[model samples]
Target: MPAFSWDTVPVYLHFGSPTKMTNEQVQTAARLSNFICLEKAHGRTTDREHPERIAAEDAQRIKTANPDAKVLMYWNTLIAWPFTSYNSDFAETHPENWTLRDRSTGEPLLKAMHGSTPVYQYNLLNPDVRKWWADTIGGAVNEFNFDGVFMDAVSQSKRPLWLQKGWGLDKADELDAAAVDMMRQTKAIIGNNRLLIYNGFRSAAGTEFLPYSDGAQIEHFDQLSSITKEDMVAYWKMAATAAKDNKIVLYKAWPDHDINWLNRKFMSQSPAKKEAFAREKITYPLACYLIGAEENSYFCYGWGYGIDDGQLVDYPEYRKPLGAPKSRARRTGWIFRREFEHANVAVDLENRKARIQWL
Candidate 1:
């Protein structure tokens, strides 16, 4: 069985800019991540330079260079948009496929979330819709030569934001169930040898559907940075649940809303100081995940400035680890303390301070 494992690597997941998935970027990401999601290979596109051909060719090249690496095709489980240049033909042909509607006007609702152009939501409860989704995922896995599938937007469809937008929680639950079934079928299609990971179920809903997939991802893990007594447990709960199942939990620290302040700030500093600052940023949060994460866990410190965003100046620190944290305990209110075999990690959440003491 070829399972997706990230224990040997410091980073678990990475995504390339849909418009910027160049050979150089793809190769570098492949070298850096145990699993990398390519937005280029699977989606419909007319850009000859960025056609699925380039992504597929590069994927094959990446595996030939690094046989141990796993490559994933990025797919939207329930998103149907009018803006997808080539995919619009398929969407326009199927009017019955659209489900999300405004109860007030009784018209189809389209909205943009997570920086995307407005898109219509699919009726996950529709058997035909789910089958259509599963088929595309299957095609991506088989046709593109991808090792697995990276399911995106699972949460946006089920999250509270959409729950009240004429759809409500009732529909959300149905959609959630349908999403899980889709993944189940996708797994069966690809076989156990291929990996199947889904994103966007990081809260309570996440726990419900997590069992259906191979790994769980904690996007915007920094949401805990609010450091309130109530906020502390949210992220850990998700991580713990995923850990108990021994699922590979990818903890992405930075959210899309935050800026790459470190990237811009380092522009004026000397190379030596910049190097020191990069290591400085890595110390605390890295330590927190090292303490909380169990076996097969992958930690990612990311930024959303854009493609090729030089947010973390010291790319080298991305490969370094705190080894394994032997013990993790709360040292004070909103403060966490962890003891590794050879290092000590202390985080003062209130002050945004993280220090690592190494022997």
Candidate 2:
């Protein structure tokens, strides 16, 4: 077997930072994962003392602290991250550039809610609009000195969903091509040295978007907690297949969303429940994520509400470091096995059992 290194095993975590993390905390997070995604919406709130914590100097701090890690910023290619929130200077001046509904109905496209936040959809088919978005968002990434950008919701700008109202037949194809070109041009502007990730592989758009992306983030693998064993195998297989062609796979399995997982208040009430909460939260998802791992893939087992959102006191659950794969991983049916220098793991997806034998 060729020598395998955990350096290639990236993990995805979101950090918007309504409150800034200490530089030491930021450094620790960098030490934890090779790929860390910081949300663009950071610094949107003026109340934040260190609004630039994730977007500016602190981002550089992460890269500086850990040269091995790639600090990426999140950008939604098709959607406008609430302009008012970003304290956007261009909001009033560039109102026309916004994706006002493709039709004459006068209503703009629907906005997708990210928790309490809303990100609006733009008319990507418009050349001028796409140009403005590229210039603005691309500039922000460069200004922040991010290693790359993680663009989300690539498919929202196209299709029977929004086009039925304001756009034309020719515009439909233009929209499709434009979405792909947006990715292409973004890579061109950012240069090939930076990482470009996209989150849209569950549909036809994946084919168009994957070629441009260095990695693909499968956002809902943690939903498997509610799924059956058969469904688990199917989902993992799809996730694995999506990782084909050496494109990095970010299997984001959020622990907070688990079925049996408790709320923030209840879990914190007592030390016992807190311990149980942390343990029960990640156990199944970690097993599924490892079983679903592919070459150049990452298993993001962190909180959905950004990685270091709450006052995370003791993460006994994720403190220990895991070694890399020692050999090529093999899967027999729903079971998967991989060896590491320190330990060997076998995951039985059908039975939902994971065995890690010490080496």
Candidate 3:
């Protein structure tokens, strides 16, 4: 495995074990990562081989390396709070304040307590739930001494259109309020003290909450096929603009099942291109250009490790390109190679050194 380094740049890493995955065999990961995030949410009760040990150990481990490292924990729950999987289920029960009403419909939208996968999401719509959320997370601070939280699914409220039919334009605002409250309460326990990272949709409206967070986990480069140095640079600039304060952790995707991407491209790419690419993203890890991820995300490495210490993962080009994909067409920079999501400007990777429009 690669050693985690947090020099001038910050590194985003995940921690977890399926079945004793955290045994001494894999424990060395702690030394290599800077930002330690737990992989699974709370596991099912029956999972005897889940990773309580690893999580607990990692939490303590992070505390042990306190001055040197900063780790964060999260409630990786599966439930969609305040909303059951039925028509206004959460609303029907609490009718008065169970679920968030659609701003346009003025009726309760069918919400799920969890997601398609079976995690428990809480009823943030209920004001009481938000308070409980603070207390729940506050305990983590006292219990593990972990740094902060990386709130996943921050934008997930809109995933199920029908169930979320209540608030059209204002639905985002309502959901965000709940999320904002969650962060506020959690931080209060720690003295408004720790860093908070958000993994939600970006909007001008979100700026209210964005400033409070230490960083934003950039969820771009999701479509493994479209991910390129240029695509990444573009997304970095786009997301960076949304968050003037939060660090931009590029969540690059390497599809987990594609064989060629796993066997060839990702694992066998040239070191120079890979280095330049990694450094480019790392250099501008945040809107302020302060940190970057040293080790790229291993999104598709479920199959196991590859030779020379590299592991195969999945990405786009599932069928395998009829010919090789484009190679170093141009090394564009900020000024000319502009692809602004706000303006629909196309990206041009023609200049190697461009000024990042972080402001």
Candidate 4:
């Protein structure tokens, strides 16, 4: 229901913090794509400032640059990171009963240690918690003028061992159902006009969340070296199916190496080297995207969500004339091929290789 159009290259930006970037860099990013998700702590200049305030400011800038742009504010579905006004307030007021706590210590179970601070998971099994969570997100979207909320960590299968140990196996099993209800409630609150895209479609089970969402994301699409043949096929089929259903499928592809590994090694390289590395590795994932992409589907090729992680870099391939897909991708074992009006695409998932020839 938000303003979205399929471009020659259907690019989506899952933008991270803009704090590090220059004004020119931020402005360039704002104009690069129409669909974007401003990641957590995007414009936060101070810890006390409400993230929504700066997020809304960033959204306004994006909308001004591209009138059709649809900006989404980031909100994690499980982890209650104390970065936002809503989460911070909830953490302060409803700490004991609303969060998943350790069975032994009775302390909140740590989801992750974020720079020495413990981030806890929400007890979504509680109906009131679900309602409050949904209401808060929906209210933020409306109040901040966001086109939608990017509901992160929407997986049913990836519960951490700490959670299983703390909340017990039974409660962990019920999370999916609770999450579905939360999504439904969130949709009701946000209304039909706003987008409710979730981080998802990793497995068949992930599809269950789609009806409540405007669409879903394939976050690990073509993540270098880690993707299997089965993964490639399954994701492609999922994207095709969702696109056919008129759902927005975000294909978050990566360069030829792991971003986590790169953050340690590659970030140390000179700007020239980094740019060259990105240029050298752009085609494979881009080709993989072309083979599977359909109407309403979008591609985001970056190493990570941050500006330093290939988000600001412009790839020539992205600007090349890519017309509509002539036909669906045809596969033979690990190799898959597809044609576009202005390009020919091929990928070998087994071999981790691809080629795109522009017409």
Model number with the top TM-score: 4
Prediction RMSDs, each to the true structure: 4.6, 4.6, 11.1, 2.3
Candidate 3 per-residue lDDT over residues 1-359, each given as its tens digit:
12223222223455343333333423444444445665443222224343333455656655465445556665522133322112123344444554455557555443332454322345566778677556755675556666776666665664556234543544556677777777777667755456666664332123355655555554433233433455555544545454344333434332222422345675566745443343343212221122112232112112212111212111121111122112212223433322221211123333222233321
lDDT string for model 2 (271-357, tens) is 555445555666566656665666677766544344343323244434444566676568898678877655567877667677755
Candidate 2's C-alpha runs over 4 A off are: 1-4, 7-10, 46-54, 83-92, 95-97, 102-104, 112-119, 158-174, 203-207, 224-244, 256-276, 307-333
Candidate 1 regions exceeding 4 Å error are: 1-9, 18-23, 40-50, 81-86, 102-107, 113-118, 159-169, 201-204, 224-229, 255-257, 260-280, 311-314, 319-321, 328-333
TM-score, structure 4 vs. true: 0.92
How many clashing residue pairs appear in each of the predictions shown?
0, 2, 33, 0
lDDT for residue 239 in candidate 1, whole number 0-100: 72
lDDT of 2 at 10: 40
- lDDT for position 88 in model 3: 23
Scored against the true structure, residue 117 in model 4 reaches a CA lDDT of: 58
Better candidate number, 1 or 3, judged by TM-score: 1
lDDT of 1 by residue, 217-288 (tens): 676565533334344457677777777886767777652224243546544556566445445566656766
Which residue pairs overlap in candidate 1's backbone?
A: none
Displacement of the residue 46 alpha carbon in candidate 1, Å: 7.8
TM-scores of all predicted structures: 0.79, 0.78, 0.56, 0.92
Q: Would you give me the overall lDDT of model 1? A: 0.61
Q: Cα miss at 152, model 3 (Å)?
A: 0.7
